[PDB]
């Protein structure tokens, strides 16, 4: 039986998001990609470098906004701009979100030598697609 990226059936009490509820064979069919760049197009270079950066940004944001992320990050690249779109919860005070936004954008801009921006969308709770 296949396992890769499959939330297995339970007793009907496990809430799953839309992304978590779709196995890998639905990528490009019912769900899009979590990162968009030109590295994987035919005749394009630097796919390896873009990949390492994406893996780091996901770990950085997970530990920088602990317990706040309500979904996976969406990483977008246009030119030399880097946009990070995250869906967060409404538990931390706004002051701490503004501190962490100013802190993370500045730190990542100096780390990867490019203008980085972080767009936050807050939700009252984790959006549930179904109960497995």
């Amino acid at each position: 039986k296949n396992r890769a990226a499959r939330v297995r059936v339970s007793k009907g009490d496990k809430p799953v998001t839309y992304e978590e509820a779709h196995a890998p064979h639905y990528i490009a069919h019912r769900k899009g990609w979590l990162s968009l760049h030109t590295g994987n197009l035919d005749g394009e270079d630097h796919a390896a470098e873009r990949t390492v950066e994406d893996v780091f940004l996901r770990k950085f944001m997970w530990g920088t906004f602990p317990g706040c992320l309500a979904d996976q990050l969406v990483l977008k690249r246009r030119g030399n701009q880097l946009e990070i779109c995250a869906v967060v919860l409404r538990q931390l005070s706004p002051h701490k979100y503004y501190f962490l936004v100013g802190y993370s954008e500045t730190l990542l801009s100096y780390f990867y030598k490019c203008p980085v921006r972080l767009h936050l969308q807050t939700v009252p709770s984790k959006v549930v697609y179904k109960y497995l």
Partner: protein, 66 residues
């Protein structure tokens, strides 16, 4: 997910207002803005290459959705 009649009445009010907003974005007459124009405008503003059309962005009348 049960849907009451007061909930559908609110969804129809939002679709009529959003339909005039969409016509305003595309610079078209809100009166003669049909569902075919809505589908065309949504495909341009929110381009989705997902193979399954049922998973693409949609803005239809509530009676055709719920």
């Amino acid at each position: 997910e049960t849907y009451t009649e007061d909930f559908i009445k609110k969804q129809i009010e939002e679709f009529n207002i959003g339909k005039r907003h969409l016509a305003n974005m595309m610079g078209e007459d809100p009166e003669t803005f049909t569902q075919e124009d809505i589908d065309r405008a949504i495909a341009y503003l929110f381009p989705s290459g997902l193979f399954e059309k049922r998973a693409r962005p949609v803005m239809k009348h509530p009676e055709q959705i719920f």
